[PDB]
Design a binder for this molecule. Sequence first.
Ligand SMILES: CCCCCCCC/C=C\CCCCCCCC(=O)O
Lengths: 223, 220, 223
Amino acid sequence: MISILHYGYSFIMLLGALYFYLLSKDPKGVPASEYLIAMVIPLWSGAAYLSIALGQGLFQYDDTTIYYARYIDWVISTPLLLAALALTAMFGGKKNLTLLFSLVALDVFMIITGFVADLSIGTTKYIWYSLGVIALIIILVITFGPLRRIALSNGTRLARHYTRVAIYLSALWVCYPTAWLLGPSGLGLAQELTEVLVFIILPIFSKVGFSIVDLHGLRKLHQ
Amino acid sequence: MISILHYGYSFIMLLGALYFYLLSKDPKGVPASEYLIAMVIPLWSGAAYLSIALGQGLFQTTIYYARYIDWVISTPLLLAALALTAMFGGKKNLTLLFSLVALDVFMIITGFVADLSIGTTKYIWYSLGVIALIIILVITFGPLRRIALSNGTRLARHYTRVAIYLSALWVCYPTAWLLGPSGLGLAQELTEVLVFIILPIFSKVGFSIVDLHGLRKLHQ
Amino acid sequence: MISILHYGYSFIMLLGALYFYLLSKDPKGVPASEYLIAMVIPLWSGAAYLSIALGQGLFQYDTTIYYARYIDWVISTPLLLAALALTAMFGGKKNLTLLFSLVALDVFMIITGFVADLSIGTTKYIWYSLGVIALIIILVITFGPLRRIALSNGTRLARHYTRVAIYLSALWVCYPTAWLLGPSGLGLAQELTEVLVFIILPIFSKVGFSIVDLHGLRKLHQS
Ligand SMILES: CCCCCCCC/C=C\CCCCCCCC(=O)O
């Protein structure tokens, strides 16, 4: 079942990527860079999850299954999602690439702490987990603080769209470390199959859902 | 023999890099960035192949993993060089350039995974890499060539020449891969080793000689 | 002792990062990019050294390889070179080609060090030698074309650049010297001696350099 779920996921990612490509052909004032980002996220995630489906992107460690292909996915897909969110805030205004790369750095560090934590045991696991959560809190502070202020500097209509996609992505963000901690990688309260389903369903909303909401909202700003 | 061939290759890469550096000192209207790219490609490939020569960049089928360490850097830089040639004298399309870089890096990764794989799984990964290569070729002879044409007859003629040159070499790599020990195992290991010594001399040094000379000629 | 030394180091890195953050809040004409770089360097080094403290970022190869040092340097050292290059270019046009030339040389340098550490006999010293050649080219760029950019940006900037260039260059040569003398090379110096050198040096490079660099740039500010 776990294999089939991953095959299904990869197919949905492919469909998402194709939809964003078709959108890119009639771009409605959205720069090509934002369509490229929207396409790379699902294609990369799709490839990583295909490796799990084929039984390659996982291995046994501490008598538990480590789905290491998830970290290979997130270390690329999640910084790109934050870049998409940052470019939305900056839409129709001057870019702040310093703030964008601040978020990329925090996010890549966050995913790495997750991988190291998964490879760790006892207090060490929760030291790495904690550093990742601290990174996420700083990302959320940037998202609803200075990044939102950039969005507001680009007018009421843009800021309204940014706030919507910021809430959407932020809601999903907090789910990942919650599931991680509850599941076999952490406290082991939640069953492996439950965790597998969460990390199939959540990413459909993040890897495809977010960019549908994001691109449609930006496209609507076009006359 | 395999060790000696790799030492020889690394020396040719060094000579190529030095030639491009000398060219960079009298640049003839070609930006320093294009000389930097031309120098990094052979130096990186040279280092990777030196690791094979020293018997480090392989594990034993024999997987020459140092080839993938090479290509994951050298091949995106070659595509960047080709994209900047198309855009020479005009506005840059960095989105299209990074599209090619992304496709190419993915392509090399599928090759490494395919090499580590067995049976149907190997050819699934190989096929994804081939699909990436086809999209790269479509971009090269489609939208990227259209950018070249927008930059005048002389530039477009040069771009078309280097595009055919690189494209000819591109298709050879996955062909040799599939025929050799990593794939169907029809070609002998020594034959594959010689192909992946000779091809790269034309790609890592040959391409940039043709590319830089053609761009420099536009200064006159 | 080795574990405790690494814990202490990581805490100093955190303090350094916080100092740079506080400086960034009253930036005195220094772009946000230079504060971001100054903060990432110690935070990344801190995380890497924390992994050694926890007994994760090293392994036996008979001899101990502190591989987390290379994970540190492959990010921290190109960022230090970027900091130095942006100092030269302060108040003037950026040369990102020269900056990325230095990044490329430096990343190659650190990789040769890792491979050298994994190597034995003549092979070790071939890789070490290629790294030293990379370092010599970096020094030639630093005191040649990069210094000429600094000079083009006025007397006061050029004076500051020269000071931070000598500071970083002095530290640069110490690393491959300690490497060669210690267990990774000739094995003249004891493990504990090498460990202390690679605790003390980085405090001067990861925090010291940016204190001197940022203070010198901030001093150029009018008002
Ligand atoms: C965890 C390691 C990841 C580190 C990657 C990013 C490090 C930050 C380095 C440089 C920041 C680049 C800022 C670009 C400045 C452009 C001007 C602007 O728009 O602000």
